[PDB]
Amino acid sequence: STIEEQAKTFLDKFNHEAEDLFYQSSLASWNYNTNITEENVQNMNNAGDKWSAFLKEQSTLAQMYPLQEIQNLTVKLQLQALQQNGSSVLSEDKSKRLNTILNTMSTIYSTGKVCNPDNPQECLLLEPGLNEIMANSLDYNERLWAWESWRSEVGKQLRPLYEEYVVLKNEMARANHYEDYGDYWRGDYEVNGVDGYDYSRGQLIEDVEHTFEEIKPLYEHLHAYVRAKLMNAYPSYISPIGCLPAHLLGDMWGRFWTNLYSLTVPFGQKPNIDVTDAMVDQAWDAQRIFKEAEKFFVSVGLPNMTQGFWENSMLTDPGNVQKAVCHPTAWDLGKGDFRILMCTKVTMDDFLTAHHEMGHIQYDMAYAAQPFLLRNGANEGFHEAVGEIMSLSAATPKHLKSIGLLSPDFQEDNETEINFLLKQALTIVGTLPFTYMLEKWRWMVFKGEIPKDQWMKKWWEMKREIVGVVEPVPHDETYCDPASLFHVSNDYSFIRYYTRTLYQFQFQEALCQAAKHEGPLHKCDISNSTEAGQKLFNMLRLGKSEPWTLALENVVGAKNMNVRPLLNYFEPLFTWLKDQNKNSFVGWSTDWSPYAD
Amino acid sequence: ASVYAWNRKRISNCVADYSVLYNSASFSTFKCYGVSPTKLNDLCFTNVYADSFVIRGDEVRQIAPGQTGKIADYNYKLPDDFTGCVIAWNSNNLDSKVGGNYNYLYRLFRKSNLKPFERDISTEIYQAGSTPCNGVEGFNCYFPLQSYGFQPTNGVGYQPYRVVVLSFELLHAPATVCGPKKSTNLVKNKCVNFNFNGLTGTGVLTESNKKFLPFQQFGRDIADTTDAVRDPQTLEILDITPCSFGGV
Ligand SMILES: *[C@@H]1O[C@H](CO)[C@@H](O[C@@H]2O[C@H](CO)[C@@H](O)[C@H](O)[C@H]2NC(C)=O)[C@H](O)[C@H]1NC(C)=O
């Protein structure tokens, strides 16, 4: 009769149906990933098509049930999430055009090849060729050639594709009563109808701007030290005052500066934090990695993890008969199905990656009792943060000593701490300005405020003012270097990384406070701390029913974004950088460029 | 079977040993309503209804007296004055399979709440609105049953759970269900206080020479005083002499 009871019964029944069908679709995806075969790919495609069709039908059937007279907060949130049709808000022809453009752009990015002029027949793709070259080869000429070739062979092709994709995204966003696609993406963080926890889309923008503003001195000092070490490695390629080259950031787009740690190490003679030698001497394997991770789980108060995962999920590469994806994936399949797909080797890096993946999986069981539409995180930067806080805690020397990876005779001096902090900053702090600028650039690109004919002229400008990095080769509007990134070329929001980093810093600080930790935050370990695990699970089990601001207040007590945990974590590194940069220029100059002498 | 088609079994004319299940120590839930498990063991009930089915863990609380829910109201309803107990245990190793054990069903949709101790197995499409179903599902018409989803990876509230409800009954009909009447050892040539199936006599039990008849149980004297009893266990006759006594 009334919309309330009928809508609630329909909600329950189609939540069960959608949970079942999403489980089937993710199971088909898992079967495809474990064994890449034609039947597996066909099952993947059929399950995905059926799931999309049924999801659209359920969303429409919920749309004919108005939310005006529905007062249940969880039901309202679920039905509003269903009502987010997105690209389907436009016509069938426009949706098909957008899908074709996205597929073409993704295919060009993935299949993009660069060919040496000396040997045209010899060509290498971005992965693993370009990444390995840019993380290993330190030659300026080869890195610059690879940079130009990858950003020209793909950027020029993707520029019209990216332009039409942006135009279409703006069209559907305006049809969705949003100013631009950036507003549509930021609407995920938006909270409405909740007293004391409402969040606006512009609030996220202003909070990100304020956080970057208060982070600016630390990043400036870090970039100054990295640049100084870069003249220490490249005396005649980078000016002491000018900005850094784009291709000398370690990777293709400057996303990760970890590859620069070899040339920017504070002390190349002091040993780094690594227990892989003892790890392989202790006859450890992937099974030992997973068992130690589960022991760490039960040590912090988290419950024992289901045996179905152990008897269903794969750990090491299943020989050569079948091909499995080596990319680390945590599949929250559905109907209480949780699996992990990675090529786990006997290494510290694989140890931390697996710890991250079972952190994701435990967060997945955390909101299992929630309905399917609420069976996810409040935003896109929570699950990765939950995995990464545990991975970083396990990476601490205390956890390695407890599990036998590190001998108790190991000495912990300021040199190792500074080296680890700088490595993390290159891995984590270095990407924060880049992620911030790239997401903002995509935001006004969707907004259309910046004229197209000088879009590139804007980009490099904010590459200089914000990142402090100057391109080695000037690029006109033909180049579409931002779209050369995987996230831009595959319709992925990029602010998720910065938000996840800040969330994980806050979570680490909260867990350390709950564990009564004393000393540096980088040496802080949540192992054998029931209070930290309980405080983490207080937000883990909440799912996406509650606002993300509510989760942040529950964890750290700060309703909005905070950087105080970041300052607490990187204070020793900040002091070390300030001490080391007293004899070098601080900041950057936009005028200087490698192509100008 | 499914919970909406819960398997009903009649237990009577048998010894119900509740000790083995009370001390097997492998079941998630054991809730006795109206009588403690220990005391009902030494108690006689006219009948027992054993309702066995499979539900989810969250629905386990639904199967309890004075409870409401999907399973409680549309699949199986318990009266408030429940006499028996409810035993539930995880069946993930048995009732959960890879791909989803969808064989089990539960009455998600129903037009009215079930009466206590009533089973509904109607497969007619429930009509949500005023639009007739016309024998097929569609708008305002949905299947009354939803398939259970069971996988080995499920959580506590989603793993399969076999539930057995043992409702006890004692009324004007003769009592049938009783626990194992504990029997002690046998003593002889000693003044002891005995009780053979209700004789409750006191005296000295000695090896007998008289022979009973197979249908006969205990002897008697001219004065209608019990003098010989056949052992309810191994078939033998014992003369009961009165406890030695006299004047001083
Ligand atoms: C009760 O059950 C017991 C089972 O042991 C029966 O007793 C056995 O009888 C045989 C007969 O030769 C003996 O050899 C065993 O030693 C006995 N076992 C005992 C006493 O524990 C007994 O017959 C049964 N009572 C009945 C059927 O009335």
Numbering used by the authors:
A (entry chain A): 19 to 614, 641
B (entry chain B): 348 to 595
Provide the authors' own sentences about this structure as they appear in the paper.
We describe the development of a biologic that takes advantage of the proximity of the N-terminus of bound ACE2 to the three-fold symmetry axis of the spike protein to create an ultrapotent, trivalent ACE2 entry antagonist. Therefore, we sought trimeric scaffolds to fuse three ACE2 moieties and leverage the inherent symmetry of the spike trimer to maximize avidity. Thus, we determined a trimeric antagonist fused to the N-terminus of ACE2 would require a short peptide linker and would be less likely to form inter-spike interactions.
To simplify the nomenclature, we refer to these constructs as TXA, where ‘T’ indicates the collagen XVIII trimerization domain, ‘X’ refers to the number of residues in the linker, and ‘A’ refers to ACE2. Notably, we did not observe discernible density for the collagen XVIII trimerization domains of the longer linker length constructs (T5A or T18A), whereas we did observe clear density connecting the trimerization domain and ACE2 in the zero-linker length, T0A. We then attempted to evaluate the ‘symmetry of interaction’ between our ACE2 constructs with spike protein (T0A-S, T3A-S, T5A-S, and T18A-S; where S is the SARS-CoV-2 spike HexaPro protein) by likening the C3 symmetry to an equilateral triangle with all sides being equal length and a corresponding standard deviation between these lengths of zero (s.d. = 0). Thus, we calculated lengths (distances) and corresponding standard deviations between the Cα atoms of equivalent residues in the RBDs of the spike protein (residue D428; as determined by Fan et al.) and in each of the ACE2 domains (residue N137; arbitrarily determined residue on ACE2) (red and black dashed lines, respectively). The calculated mean distances and s.d. between spike RBD were: 41 ± 3.6 Å for T0A-S; 40 ± 1.0 Å for T3A-S; 40 ± 1.0 Å for T5A-S; and 42 ± 3.2 Å for T18A-S. Equating lower s.d. values to symmetry, we determine T3A and T5A to have higher symmetry than T0A or T18A.
